[PDB]
Design a protein around this ligand. Structure first.
Ligand SMILES: CC(C)[C@H](C(=O)O)[C@@H](O)C(=O)O
Ligand SMILES: CC(C)[C@H](C(=O)O)[C@@H](O)C(=O)O
Ligand SMILES: [Ca+2]
Ligand SMILES: [Ca+2]
Ligand SMILES: [Cl-]
Ligand SMILES: [Cl-]
Lengths: 364, 364
């Protein structure tokens, strides 16, 4: 009946932008008659401060009792010296992905109208625009392969990670890419290193097996070094990019940065069962925390992804997305979206969330 | 006394641009009194056509008898359907790297004066310019880690690669990055995934050990997803980038493509003993082969790297490099370096090589 959401705002800008997401969710709950209940739990640096680890057992159990995770961001200079395997970012996100089998990471990156000038692309390339979905496999490959560790001492001491994929793992992520391409521009570009990696050979093989179920989707394969070049040059030629864990990590971020506007971008990590973790694409931005400056759009759109993907509340998801569009087209842009000669029009985080919740309320 | 060079021109544009490199080498041999002897050997697609494999035993022995490999490029649509582990590119380059212990890959990427407009960067970013050396570890990590293969059948069939580094391997590549930074702008940015990979943890550790020998070089560490974002945005803040095999593969290419002019860029792969493989950064470009269009500068500068690094002919190396500079600043640019309204000034491959050998002869 009534949904349960684990709210894991984390560090840096996380709590202030989460507050705006929740404000917009409040407008949406009222308009569509949704009963969503939320519990906040510490994660990342605040969980190390409050509890000794980045992912407290109680945060984890709070997530198991939820229909979805509304996730902020984690990490910060204060923990940026700890043992890698106790650090907040990887300490929160990987065990969360692993525990809940969040194998599928979706990060759509589009160049928004009017914001071309912010993209780091040459103006004729950004004028062409782009819209690229990164479908990234999230629970296997080299992130979670075993053996992983190190042996020896001295010069001969060595450390090792194993990159591993099974046909089952590749085909379930491929299907996601293919179904997504179907509702977009019907191209999957599968990104691998099949000239080098036994994993990438099986990857490329399996993805071709899956393509039989999609006669309407065009499939092409590309090496990750090649894909990263080609995205700087002609991002407009890609529709869906299907990648393994390590390659999609690189690619999702690259494409996000080519937008020039990461504060507008969000991410859905999902398991096969409808449960997911929804977060902004960009970091916790500790330099701007507590100052009313952070763009809450990324976090607000994470909430929209949460409603659509985990809560089956498509209408409520699209209302938020249209309220965001409304803001971007009505002079409601935070400072990092504005050119330096326009930066005086900058809206604060709270102003951004107020406007966007108001637009939902007004029936946008 | 007299040097011996294995000339492995390969496929596509390889032979035509190699011809220009050799023309320029002829001018240089005459001017500095160098006795270099060359033998040509098939590699890549022409070696599959002529001999059944991308790296004939006799090509390999020809390389063992040489002081250096002057390498063109390999690959082409004609072989672009073969078993990955028989394909020309990986079939030529990895066994060459492995056999001769070419652990160190150097690819400097600079934005040339007057060519800013070609870079895919937004004009204010390309106007800032950049000069980034990728130091990439070439003989270990995941390219050559074992175990590598696959087991099983059906859904549960899995393929695996092991990413492996020893302290010895990391420290010898780190030293190269550090010595290079010393003669540049004294910063090494070491690029890893230490939040995820046991290899990257040891990587980051060891590189910090090496930094003690270089109190004058600034060291920083960065994740590969982060490094790839930051290079699109502010390439000017990096001096030397120190990477493992898989990450440096991605990064070298990304940075090369950010120049907008890959046909000017070259690569040195070297072992500890002075022997190396010298090649252009860019592919074999089969669409433009045999038409007199390919930019030979990349291959001509590979020859210069060959002279400096393997042949201890610094003066001859710098003469070629100045002859190239002379061409770029005297209206001798091939078509892909020219804006479409200027493309009528385009010089052919042969014209490019003639000019550049003439400049060496003239005492540039
Ligand atoms: C913090 C890190 C482990 C994580 C990853 O590599 O998955 C991050 O880079 C991401 O994009 O979620
Ligand atoms: C062909 C391929 C195996 C090779 C590599 O990955 O090393 C290439 O991408 C490179 O940059 O040399
Ligand atoms: Ca990332
Ligand atoms: Ca490459
Ligand atoms: Cl992976
Ligand atoms: Cl590697």
């Amino acid at each position: 009946s009534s949904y349960q959401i684990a709210v894991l705002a984390g560090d840096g800008i996380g709590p202030e932008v989460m507050a705006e997401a929740r404000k917009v969710l409040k407008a949406v709950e009222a308009r569509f008659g949704l009963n969503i209940e939320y519990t906040e739990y510490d994660v990342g640096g605040i969980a190390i401060d409050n509890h000794g680890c980045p992912l407290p057992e109680a945060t984890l159990k709070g997530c198991e009792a939820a229909d979805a995770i509304l996730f902020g961001s984690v990490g910060g200079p204060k923990w940026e010296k700890l043992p890698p395997n106790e650090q907040p970012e990887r300490g929160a996100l990987l065990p969360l992905r692993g525990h809940f089998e969040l194998f599928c990471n979706l990060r759509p990156a589009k160049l928004h109208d009017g914001l071309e000038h912010m993209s780091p692309l040459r103006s004729d390339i950004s004028a062409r625009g782009f819209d690229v979905l990164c479908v990234r496999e999230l629970t296997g490959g080299i992130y979670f392969g075993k053996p992983k560790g190190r042996q020896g001492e001295g010069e001969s001491e060595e450390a090792f990670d194993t990159m591993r994929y099974s046909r089952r793992e590749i085909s379930r992520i491929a299907r996601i890419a293919f179904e997504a391409a179907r509702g977009r521009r019907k191209k999957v570009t599968s990104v691998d290193k099949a000239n080098v990696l036994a994993c990438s050979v099986l990857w490329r093989q399996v993805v071709e097996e899956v393509a039989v179920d999609f006669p309407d989707v065009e499939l092409e394969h590309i090496y990750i070094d090649n894909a990263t070049m080609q995205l700087l040059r002609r991002p407009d030629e890609f529709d869906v990019m299907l990648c393994s864990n390590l390659f999609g990590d690189i690619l999702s971020d690259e494409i996000a940065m080519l937008t020039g506007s990461m504060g507008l971008l969000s991410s859905a990590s999902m398991n096969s069962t409808g449960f997911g973790l929804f977060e902004p694409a960009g970091g916790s931005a500790p330099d701007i925390a507590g100052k009313g400056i952070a763009n809450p759009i990324a976090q607000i759109l994470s909430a929209a992804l949460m409603l659509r993907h985990s809560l089956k509340q498509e209408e409520a998801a699209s209302a938020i997305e249209r309220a965001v569009t409304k803001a971007l087209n009505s002079g409601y842009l935070t400072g990092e979206l504005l050119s330096s000669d326009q930066r005086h029009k900058a809206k604060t985080t709270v102003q951004m969330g107020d406007f966007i919740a108001d637009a939902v309320k007004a029936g946008v």
